[PDB]
Amino acid sequence: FVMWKFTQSRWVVRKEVATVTKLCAEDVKDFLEHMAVVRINKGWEFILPYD
Amino acid sequence: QPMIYICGECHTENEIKSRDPIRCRECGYRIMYKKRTKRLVVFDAR
Amino acid sequence: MIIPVRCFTCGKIVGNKWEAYLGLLQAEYTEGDALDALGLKRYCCRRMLLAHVDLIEKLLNYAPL
Amino acid sequence: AASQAVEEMRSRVVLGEFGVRNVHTTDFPGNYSGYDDAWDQDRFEKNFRVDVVHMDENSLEFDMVGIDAAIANAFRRILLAEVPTMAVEKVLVYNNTSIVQDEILAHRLGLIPIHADPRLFEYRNQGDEEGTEIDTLQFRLQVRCTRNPHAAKDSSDPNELYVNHKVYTRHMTWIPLGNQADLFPEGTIRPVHDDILIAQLRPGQEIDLLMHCVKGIGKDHAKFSPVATASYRLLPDITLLEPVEGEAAEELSRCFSPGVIEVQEVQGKKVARVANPRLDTFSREIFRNEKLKKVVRLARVRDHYIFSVESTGVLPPDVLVSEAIKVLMGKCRRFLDELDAVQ
Amino acid sequence: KTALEMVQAAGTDRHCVTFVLHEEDHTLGNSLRYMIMKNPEVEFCGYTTTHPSESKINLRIQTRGTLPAVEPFQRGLNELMNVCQHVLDKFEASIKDYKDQKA
Ligand SMILES: [Zn+2]
Ligand SMILES: [Zn+2]
């Protein structure tokens, strides 16, 4: 689901993922840290640029 | 007189009488704690 | 183990501001602006919330259940 | 001149680079030559005033002018300790299976403020652990955590898996004694904040207990203190010895609080002036600027006390200040009665 | 049994007295010291705490002439009570008219 959201949009909201997947906060954080970085006032951004 | 204990992983109420080898049904675990007392206890908020 | 109800120095009620604080961390808020939004002006309550470790759920993972 | 120095000594508290000066109250009869500092009730009643500047729920701010440091400190200390309130003292525990220890749980429960009005109760007598309708309150806390019968297959979050896994203070239910149900309308007696996290549970664990609350003063224990923070500060009065203009005026605006010094273009050039000296906190950053050290004179008005009273929600802070003043009056009356009995 | 007088010595001189006040602390001690020091007939007024463990204070009053040093004590208590009443009235008026102008 996280990867599909990243395909759909470059920015992913952590709270939305937590709500949709019903998963705990730390598991969502582990999912995001593998492929995303925190950008303040914008959420989580994909770590690599569009190639 | 029903003496009741709680095993460490089943957490099920087991009634065992005196001089019984400590075990539990639906397990084999052998740490058998005692349930909390029913007597009222008064505590001070200090 | 768990968040203290009162701030140690001043005495402001800080126990009820813990989980909401986590929500602000579940949101995009930084630590400082989340503390500001919670209304902790003096730095003692900010130290209370910022330096607290939530060991209660880790201990509950070892609870009998 | 000498008269100006005497007036500054007896009216102002100056903050130097390394230390404060003129901190002691000195207006006493015989202390000064050209001044009659003997007590005058009429003069004090003329000069004294109270001005409320900000007041919402659980927060009050007001300036008192004409009072001295001793009386202001007495009011602050009475508010901090000598104002009686309602708080939990006794905890009777029936089958506490929670991870939180019984003594820790009781200590946490004691710190929870209670919205009951303390004036309507009396101090419980020495002993008398049973308590009567007049001088106690009872709160029932019974939370049994169990698995949610309907949940998702994964349900990683404890909220979906479990119910009553967080024992909030809203689970506390008031148990009326005697005729307290008639005297107090429903909803008046309750925990103040309604959201304080008391403990955390897992299925199977249960917390069943009763709480006896009795009247008490903050001097006995800090859980009885009504005010979160009751403090006072002397009103600052920043003065400019010489007119500061140019970019150095902007430097002045950056040395102090953002809202105290304002720069204006009277003739197209920026000149600084004191706008709101109240907003200053005296970070004393003007002393870092070598040039600007000798152009300002930071000071506090001796007889101008801004009181900030942030309460815990037991009752509105204005009633708290009234109760503090009445407690000081009661102490004075008690000692006058003792003196009369002696003579 | 709360406030007890103690004269300067066995001679029982009324010029120098010590009032021991029970279950009291720096609040009343300091306020009363301020209110009684303003009396012109008091040479020396001063309170101290015997020990932080026990809740009692010792006020000492030494007058100039032949005052019994109990009259300044009663006068200071009365002045403090009157001041407290006046500040209570003024604060209530300020709160009330602040509320009225708010609405
Ligand atoms: Zn078993
Ligand atoms: Zn604090």
UniProtKB/Swiss-Prot annotation, chain A:
Transmembrane regions: none
Cellular localisation: Nucleus
Superkingdom of the source species: Eukaryota
Record's function text: DNA-dependent RNA polymerase catalyzes the transcription of DNA into RNA using the four ribonucleoside triphosphates as substrates. Specific peripheric component of RNA polymerase III (Pol III) which synthesizes small non-coding RNAs including 5S rRNA, snRNAs, tRNAs and miRNAs from at least 500 distinct genomic loci. Assembles with POLR3D/RPC4 forming a subcomplex that binds the Pol III core. Enables recruitment of Pol III at transcription initiation site and drives transcription initiation from both type 2 and type 3 DNA promoters.
Oligomeric form and interacting partners: Component of the RNA polymerase III complex consisting of at least 17 subunits: a ten-subunit horseshoe-shaped catalytic core composed of POLR3A/RPC1, POLR3B/RPC2, POLR1C/RPAC1, POLR1D/RPAC2, POLR3K/RPC10, POLR2E/RPABC1, POLR2F/RPABC2, POLR2H/RPABC3, POLR2K/RPABC4 and POLR2L/RPABC5; the stalk composed of two subunits POLR3H/RPC8 and CRCP/RPC9, forming a structural mobile part that protrudes out of the core and functions primarily in transcription initiation; and additional subunits homologous to general transcription factors of the RNA polymerase II machinery, POLR3D/RPC4-POLR3E/RPC5 heterodimer and POLR3/CRPC3-POLR3F/RPC6-POLR3G/RPC7 heterotrimer.
Species assigned in the record: Homo sapiens
UniProtKB/Swiss-Prot annotation, chain C:
GO MF entry, a single one: zinc ion binding
The UniProt record lists the keyword Ligase: no
Keywords: DNA-directed RNA polymerase, Metal-binding, Nucleus, Transcription, Zinc
Protein name, UniProt field: DNA-directed RNA polymerases I, II, and III subunit RPABC5
GN (gene name): POLR2L
Binding site for Zn(2+): 7, 10, 44-45
UniProt KW RNA-binding keyword: no
Pfam families, A to Z: RNA_pol_N
UniProt similarity note: Belongs to the archaeal Rpo10/eukaryotic RPB10 RNA polymerase subunit family.
NCBIfam families found in the cross-reference section: PRK04016.1
Function: DNA-dependent RNA polymerase catalyzes the transcription of DNA into RNA using the four ribonucleoside triphosphates as substrates. Common component of RNA polymerases I, II and III which synthesize ribosomal RNA precursors, mRNA precursors and many functional non-coding RNAs, and a small RNAs, such as 5S rRNA and tRNAs, respectively.
Classification via InterPro entries: RNA_pol_su_RPB10, RNA_pol_suN_Zn-BS, RPABC5/Rpb10
Quaternary assembly: Component of the RNA polymerase I (Pol I), RNA polymerase II (Pol II) and RNA polymerase III (Pol III) complexes consisting of at least 13, 12 and 17 subunits, respectively. Pol I complex consists of a ten-subunit catalytic core composed of POLR1A/RPA1, POLR1B/RPA2, POLR1C/RPAC1, POLR1D/RPAC2, POLR1H/RPA12, POLR2E/RPABC1, POLR2F/RPABC2, POLR2H/RPABC3, POLR2K/RPABC4 and POLR2L/RPABC5; a mobile stalk subunit POLR1F/RPA43 protruding from the core and additional subunits homologous to general transcription factors POLR1E/RPA49 and POLR1G/RPA34.
Domain of life: Eukaryota
Native species: Homo sapiens
Record localization: Nucleus; Nucleus, Nucleolus
From Swiss-Prot, chain D:
GO molecular function annotations of the record: DNA binding; DNA-directed RNA polymerase activity; protein dimerization activity
Any GO BP: transcription by RNA polymerase I
Gene Ontology CC, one term: fibrillar center
Domain of life: Eukaryota
Keyword Transcription applies: yes
Pfam families named among the record's database cross-references: RNA_pol_A_bac, RNA_pol_L
Compartments it resides in: Nucleus; Nucleus, Nucleolus; Cytoplasm, Cytosol
UniProt keyword Cell wall biogenesis/degradation present: no
Record keywords: Acetylation, Cytoplasm, Disease variant, DNA-directed RNA polymerase, Leukodystrophy, Nucleus, Phosphoprotein, Transcription
Disease: Treacher Collins syndrome 3: A form of Treacher Collins syndrome, a disorder of craniofacial development. Treacher Collins syndrome is characterized by a combination of bilateral downward slanting of the palpebral fissures, colobomas of the lower eyelids with a paucity of eyelashes medial to the defect, hypoplasia of the facial bones, cleft palate, malformation of the external ears, atresia of the external auditory canals, and bilateral conductive hearing loss.
The protein's role, per its UniProt record: DNA-dependent RNA polymerase catalyzes the transcription of DNA into RNA using the four ribonucleoside triphosphates as substrates. Common component of RNA polymerases I and III which synthesize ribosomal RNA precursors and short non-coding RNAs including 5S rRNA, snRNAs, tRNAs and miRNAs, respectively. POLR1C/RPAC1 is part of the polymerase core and may function as a clamp element that moves to open and close the cleft.
Native species: Homo sapiens (Human)
From Swiss-Prot, chain E:
Record localization: Nucleus; Nucleus, Nucleolus
UniProt KW Nucleotidyltransferase keyword: no
GO CC terms in record: RNA polymerase I complex; RNA polymerase III complex
GO MF, one annotated term: DNA-directed RNA polymerase activity
GO process annotations (BP): transcription by RNA polymerase III; transcription elongation by RNA polymerase I
Keyword match Acetylation: yes
Alphabetic keyword roster: Acetylation, Disease variant, DNA-directed RNA polymerase, Nucleus, Transcription
Main subcellular location: nucleus
Domain of life assignment: Eukaryota
Self-association and partners: Component of the RNA polymerase I and RNA polymerase III complexes consisting of at least 13 and 17 subunits, respectively. Pol I complex consists of a ten-subunit catalytic core composed of POLR1A/RPA1, POLR1B/RPA2, POLR1C/RPAC1, POLR1D/RPAC2, POLR1H/RPA12, POLR2E/RPABC1, POLR2F/RPABC2, POLR2H/RPABC3, POLR2K/RPABC4 and POLR2L/RPABC5; a mobile stalk subunit POLR1F/RPA43 protruding from the core and additional subunits homologous to general transcription factors POLR1E/RPA49 and POLR1G/RPA34.
Family in the record: Belongs to the archaeal Rpo11/eukaryotic RPB11/RPC19 RNA polymerase subunit family.
Function: DNA-dependent RNA polymerase catalyzes the transcription of DNA into RNA using the four ribonucleoside triphosphates as substrates. Common component of RNA polymerases I and III which synthesize ribosomal RNA precursors and short non-coding RNAs including 5S rRNA, snRNAs, tRNAs and miRNAs, respectively.
This protein's name: DNA-directed RNA polymerases I and III subunit RPAC2
Gene that this sequence comes from: POLR1D
